Amino acid sequence: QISVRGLAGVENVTELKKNFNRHLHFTLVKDRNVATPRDYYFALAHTVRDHLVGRWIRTQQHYYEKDPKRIYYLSLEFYMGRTLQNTMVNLALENACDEATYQLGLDMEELEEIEEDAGLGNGGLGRLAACFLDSMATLGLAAYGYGIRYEFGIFNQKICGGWQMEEADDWLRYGNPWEKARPEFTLPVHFYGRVEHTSQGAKWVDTQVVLAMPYDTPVPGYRNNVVNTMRLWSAKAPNDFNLGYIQAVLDRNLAENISRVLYPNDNFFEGKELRLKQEYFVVAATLQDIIRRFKSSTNFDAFPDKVAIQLNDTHPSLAIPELMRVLVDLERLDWDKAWEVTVKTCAYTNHTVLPEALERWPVHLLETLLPRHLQIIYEINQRFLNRVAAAFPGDVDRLRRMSLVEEGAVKRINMAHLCIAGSHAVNGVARIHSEILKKTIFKDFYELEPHKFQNKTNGITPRRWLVLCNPGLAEIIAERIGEEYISDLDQLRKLLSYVDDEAFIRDVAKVKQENKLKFAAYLEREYKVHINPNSLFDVQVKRIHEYKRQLLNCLHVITLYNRIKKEPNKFVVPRTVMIGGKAAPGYHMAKMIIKLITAIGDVVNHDPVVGDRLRVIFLENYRVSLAEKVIPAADLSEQISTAGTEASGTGNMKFMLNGALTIGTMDGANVEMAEEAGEENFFIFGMRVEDVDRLDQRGYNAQEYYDRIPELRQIIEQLSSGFFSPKQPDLFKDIVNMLMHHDRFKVFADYEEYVKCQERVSALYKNPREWTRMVIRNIATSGKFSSDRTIAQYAREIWGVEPSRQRLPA
Amino acid sequence: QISVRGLAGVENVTELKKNFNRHLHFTLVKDRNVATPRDYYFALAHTVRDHLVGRWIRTQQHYYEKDPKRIYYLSLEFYMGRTLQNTMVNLALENACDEATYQLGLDMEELEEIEEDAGLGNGGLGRLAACFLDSMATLGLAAYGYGIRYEFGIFNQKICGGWQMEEADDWLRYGNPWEKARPEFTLPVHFYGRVEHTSQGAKWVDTQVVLAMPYDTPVPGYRNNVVNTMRLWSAKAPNDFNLGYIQAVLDRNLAENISRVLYPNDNFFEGKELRLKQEYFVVAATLQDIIRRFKSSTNFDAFPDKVAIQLNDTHPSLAIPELMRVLVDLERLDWDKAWEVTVKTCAYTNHTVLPEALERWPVHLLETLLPRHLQIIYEINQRFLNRVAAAFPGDVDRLRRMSLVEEGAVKRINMAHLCIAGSHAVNGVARIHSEILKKTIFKDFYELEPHKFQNKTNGITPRRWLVLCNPGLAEIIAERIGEEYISDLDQLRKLLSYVDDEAFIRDVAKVKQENKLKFAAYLEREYKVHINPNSLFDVQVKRIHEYKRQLLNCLHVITLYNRIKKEPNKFVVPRTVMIGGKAAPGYHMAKMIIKLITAIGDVVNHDPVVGDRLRVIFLENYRVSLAEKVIPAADLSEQISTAGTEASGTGNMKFMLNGALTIGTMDGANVEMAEEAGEENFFIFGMRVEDVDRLDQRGYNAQEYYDRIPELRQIIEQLSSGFFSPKQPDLFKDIVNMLMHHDRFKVFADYEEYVKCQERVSALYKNPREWTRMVIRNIATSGKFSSDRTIAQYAREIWGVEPSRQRLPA
Numbered sequence A, B: 001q002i003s004v005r006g007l008a009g010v011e012n013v014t015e016l017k018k019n020f021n022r023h024l025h026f027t028l029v030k031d032r033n034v035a036t037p038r039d040y041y042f043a044l045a046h047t048v049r050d051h052l053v054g055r056w057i058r059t060q061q062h063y064y065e066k067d068p069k070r071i072y073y074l075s076l077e078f079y080m081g082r083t084l085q086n087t088m089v090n091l092a093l094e095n096a097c098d099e100a101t102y103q104l105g106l107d108m109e110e111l112e113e114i115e116e117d118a119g120l121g122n123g124g125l126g127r128l129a130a131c132f133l134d135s136m137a138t139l140g141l142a143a144y145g146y147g148i149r150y151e152f153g154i155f156n157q158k159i160c161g162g163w164q165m166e167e168a169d170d171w172l173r174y175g176n177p178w179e180k181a182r183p184e185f186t187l188p189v190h191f192y193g194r195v196e197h198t199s200q201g202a203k204w205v206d207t208q209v210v211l212a213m214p215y216d217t218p219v220p221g222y223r224n225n226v227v228n229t230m231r232l233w234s235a236k237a238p239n240d241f242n243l244g245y246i247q248a249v250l251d252r253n254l255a256e257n258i259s260r261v262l263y264p265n266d267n268f269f270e271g272k273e274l275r276l277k278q279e280y281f282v283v284a285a286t287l288q289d290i291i292r293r294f295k296s297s298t299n300f301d302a303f304p305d306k307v308a309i310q311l312n313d314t315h316p317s318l319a320i321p322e323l324m325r326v327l328v329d330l331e332r333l334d335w336d337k338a339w340e341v342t343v344k345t346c347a348y349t350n351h352t353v354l355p356e357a358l359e360r361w362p363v364h365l366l367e368t369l370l371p372r373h374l375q376i377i378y379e380i381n382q383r384f385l386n387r388v389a390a391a392f393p394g395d396v397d398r399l400r401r402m403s404l405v406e407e408g409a410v411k412r413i414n415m416a417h418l419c420i421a422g423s424h425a426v427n428g429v430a431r432i433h434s435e436i437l438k439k440t441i442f443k444d445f446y447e448l449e450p451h452k453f454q455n456k457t458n459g460i461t462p463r464r465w466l467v468l469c470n471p472g473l474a475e476i477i478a479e480r481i482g483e484e485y486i487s488d489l490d491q492l493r494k495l496l497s498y499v500d501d502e503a504f505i506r507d508v509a510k511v512k513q514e515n516k517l518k519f520a521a522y523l524e525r526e527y528k529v530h531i532n533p534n535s536l537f538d539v540q541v542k543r544i545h546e547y548k549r550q551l552l553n554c555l556h557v558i559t560l561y562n563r564i565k566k567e568p569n570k571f572v573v574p575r576t577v578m579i580g581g582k583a584a585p586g587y588h589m590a591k592m593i594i595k596l597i598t599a600i601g602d603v604v605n606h607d608p609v610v611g612d613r614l615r616v617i618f619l620e621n622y623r624v625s626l627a628e629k630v631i632p633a634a635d636l637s638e639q640i641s642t643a644g645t646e647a648s649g650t651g652n653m654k655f656m657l658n659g660a661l662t663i664g665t666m667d668g669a670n671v672e673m674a675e676e677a678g679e680e681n682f683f684i685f686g687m688r689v690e691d692v693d694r695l696d697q698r699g700y701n702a703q704e705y706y707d708r709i710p711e712l713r714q715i716i717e718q719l720s721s722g723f724f725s726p727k728q729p730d731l732f733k734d735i736v737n738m739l740m741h742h743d744r745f746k747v748f749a750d751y752e753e754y755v756k757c758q759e760r761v762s763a764l765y766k767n768p769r770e771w772t773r774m775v776i777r778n779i780a781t782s783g784k785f786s787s788d789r790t791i792a793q794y795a796r797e798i799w800g801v802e803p804s805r806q807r808l809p810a
């Protein structure tokens, strides 16, 4: 049907049909008469996976022969979503599969909806890892994603009486056709034990053993025949484990609980033992495999020329003392050389400056669990603080601030400090965030070693986030400029010369309208929810967090409602306001914010005076596959964190790529987005970082906004008095209380400028042609925010490898 | 190579090689350069499974079309062993695979040794189920084996310092290519809850739900293109399960512990909650599937014409009140009709008369776990005891003996009594065992309803137990008489006319010698153990149990040793005595018997005076695949249970089929074996059942044997005084104590006749020609003990179906 979806050759289609039928019969052990759509999905999924494997085997052999430097991306999170369409897209098989399945009398889109998301992440950080893997393979780097094969990913979210309820995401119930179990490469991981000293050094003894079993999933590059590997570890008990006989066998579960479940706290640290076991487990098993692979090239000096390890936040920071443990205790390198090797090998990415998100592990945990790694960390700390002392003689307060060991009621190890000490590069994830790091939390480190500190502004893969989810927009772009922009997103700049082309204006607005019609219909069929598709689609989707200020969004919605009630017969640009996202299970305030959002819809959506001029919809179970449907339907993107708190953001980029305009603070990557499109083509409002600090010094007093803004006071009074919760009049007193007295994120300070900026958006919306021209201006300047540009900077400036767009042979 | 192994056609071989290579590449994602033998096994296993599926699908469709009466074989045990060679054999693919793999430069036998046993049973009862499934499909019956997919089968046994040590049998580590997960047919099973009464009857409410997920494994008949199904259930948690969030997710394991592990107690009842959950789980899930399948034929009168359910011991006896629960509470049939349907549907097989092996569940368990099934069982008991009262008016003692409810400190439900009440047929497993049932434990039942009681003497599948494990013997048999005996074992009778054929005598003795040479070499390569292959191979392999009297065997071995020490220069027929078998984990005496056997080898095997005239070897980890190697190497089969205790035995048949002679008591099927071959062709010794009762009346006094038999006294003194345990002189005082004072099985009473009968065996062994002629006489009369004859009797006399040897189309 559409051009960027590849060829449907006679030979290809005929072949696909036969392999589809072979898998239906032989693999599924089904006959056409009892197959359900789910069986058809599987037959298709196995048929497409067949095309990968040859490429998978030849890529992995090519690396063994040529021996390039390898990149190991360690992360506790890989938010992959679905694999089928992405694989079709990267292999140019999409039109052929469509044809082949159409001829068997099936609808490929129906089938794609049956695939479970691999929800092995929480949000922005785990999805960055996913975009990165795709960019690494598109750019021909010999790169391996390593993590944990969680048996339950992020919980599925149900809304019940307006409240979030969690349920287990049993994503593997029906099998995962994409993975290949690799029990032959099972590896031991050690916990507990104690440290013995011999004449030949330290020895870690009496440990419990958990085996790590690898599962490999292929990662295809974009039409370059590269297929890289994501290797995820699964925990297994050893066979002599505790070996009532019956009880001994059942207790094997204690060991395998390590890979059972993903911790669902985003931007919040929970110091629980099970988490730290997961952290050590991925790092222990990954480093043996790395070293094994290196020894099949004695000489560790060349280790940093053959290996790069990227640490995705501090989660795998135990890689640093573990690499020392292996080099010093097992290989018998001396300390100083092991340390040189380790620093040259590791690099660390920070994703936050929020105090509560930083990992600081109680020393009593590390002591019990990892008594040798604690010893190594104290030694790292001592040698490091000696370099500090030597450089800032006398500055005792610097020593206590810079220490890897925090003193206090419970001593803690500050894992970020460890990473900066043992890495040759540390980077933030947007220009402003990187600057904040150097001026604030890591200032002392920066003065010590300014040359470690870098920026690598985040990006998103244009494959998933454009070609896969928005074929209509990819297609009209490609009619004008060709196809090359898909792996060179800077080419979108050529679209600037079409800003005054009447036919192009009309095709952009037409693609948006179609996407909105398709999303409106997904809403009714799957959730009996009922919307005007001519309305402006105002969307805020991301994890529920106070800093993300969904509450600010809420106050705007209530203000619009109150302005309609006050003058019902006055015209307003109609909106569909959609907010979506998961709250972590113990984050009480996040759960209250969800409940408020639904309580608002309850009032607003059934007010007959409002008509279809205002609807508030909470999007349930937001996740990757739902992002792919809603983002291309969006007209307005809400990116309204308090300035200084959102390290980068990446939703913001997905929306800009897909023809939504942005309303945002100068936060994170919003700053670079605006600078790329021109501030005139962006709806910026509210405090800058500088303004927030000024306010923090005087002191933030919210009563002051409440006394001066009648519209705001009326909302607060409606909240306290039970207007949004008539049977529980005090339902929301926690929120009101927090907003009035304990608001770390200054919702009231930005309210006024936010509302006025919201009027400027409705006004452009009234002028379709001029809305669409600003849209083209955004789309056209989104090139920088491709993950291919990001990974190329990592590769050149951190890993020391040269990207390559050259096809490997078929 | 050999004729009964099928054709190696050019076209077939060429095809196998290509599919082998396809699976290596696409399924295994390996290249020839890194494949290990284990990968080659898998490529072969998938290539052979491809040939099954077409037949599997067409068999299952043929039953749906024709709708014959279906047989449901319920068992908690299916001792399958390996599947690959058996599948090749039943599909006539064996020579072709041999050829095809030989041309890829591989050794098929090497590959077969990589397959794990499916050890989902304990011994004779779970292996009977396995032979039965094979016979049911060979005979074209529409039959389904239902049980439990245990994640850990019988433990692997290691001997350490002479002691058994257990370890978990992680048989699924590398995947099971034979099974097909069927998550689409997942079913709910209920536990706990309470019973409510409405105006519309009883209702079972507030239950916990465990899902049962089915895994299907194909069961091929012998060259008839029938492939039946073994469906095994796996326990899964529901998704809202308990739904700390983290803890809620981890506790999903409590539910899935139901299918985690096979209970390893054989012939001994352990009344543990986890066991009863397993029992209910298999029965609950199986009956829904049965009823589902029946409703795709409203009218329950025809239920017994469409369904037979065979109960393998009392383990699935909850089928009886569950079928009532479904008919009466769910379908709203009235009691009396539901009961007629249930009786006409169920039949029960007993496998033991040992008091300690019978299931008697505490009422407080059933009450908590299954409160509705307890109610139904009390109602069954009351109506049943009313029929007894009506028939034997006044006989109060009969009422208490026959009750399903045993009174006592804890009230118990006697599950055998339940089965006899709710089944139209009850059967023992050998003629003498069936007689004992009617004269003793079930006498009262027999007088009430004599027409329920039947015999179905056990059998073994000649496929596995002859063609698969003994190709050499199958082959010389087939040269003379053709191939038809493989599915008509009565034809072996024709071999009687070759008893005086010199060439045949020599080919039987040659096959035995070769098997012994191959087993001698398996012993050295895999266990550094060192034997004379010219010796008589004296073998007792079966679970370690006091009633099986491995101790009697032990005393004989010590007597031979002592006779050698007393006259070293006198000639004796040399023997290799091999004893093997697993002891259940808490059975202390069974573990001591293993330790004695090794302690004896320790003395005997290193006595330089003994030379290679006597060796005692404990065969470690006895299981199905080890049975297939040792049984055709055996010259002498030890079947020496105290008469009246071994219900049938089936090892005894495997040995007789494979050219070992039998030394045995008149116990179980030994009685019919001797009657088939002629008592002259069998080494029978010791008490008959009648003699045992006579001894029980006077009272068994072991001191009497010890005072009258000097050879026996010397053994006991050597045991007490530390001769077999010099560093622990009192190691064996438990055994001596038991033998002297508390021997339920009368080891001393049979000692004398056993030793003298052991001399008669050595004497025939001295005359190879005459040994071999008696062997031919056994082999030739083994036809009765085929499982095809057994299943044909079940089918005709119990299930009401007609077997058929007709091929389904290819």
Ligand SMILES: O=c1[nH]c(=O)n([C@@H]2O[C@H](CO)[C@@H](O)[C@H](O)[C@H]2O)cc1Cl
Residues within 6 Å of the ligand: A122, A123, A124, A125, A126, A128, A265, A266, A267, A268, A313, A351, A352, A357, A429, A458, A646, A647, A648, A649, A650, A668
């Ligand atoms: O726990 C976390 N989870 C997460 O999604 N991020 C995000 O990481 C994203 C990727 O860097 C980034 O765009 C966004 O600004 C961050 O909030 C950071 C932490 Cl520390």
Ligand SMILES: O=c1[nH]c(=O)n([C@@H]2O[C@H](CO)[C@@H](O)[C@H](O)[C@H]2O)cc1Cl
Residues within 6 Å of the ligand: B122, B123, B124, B125, B126, B128, B265, B266, B267, B268, B313, B351, B352, B357, B429, B458, B646, B647, B648, B649, B650, B668
């Ligand atoms: O728990 C058991 N396990 C077992 O193997 N059998 C055997 O069942 C075998 C099959 O009927 C039979 O030959 C043998 O005589 C029995 O001991 C019986 C019980 Cl009750």
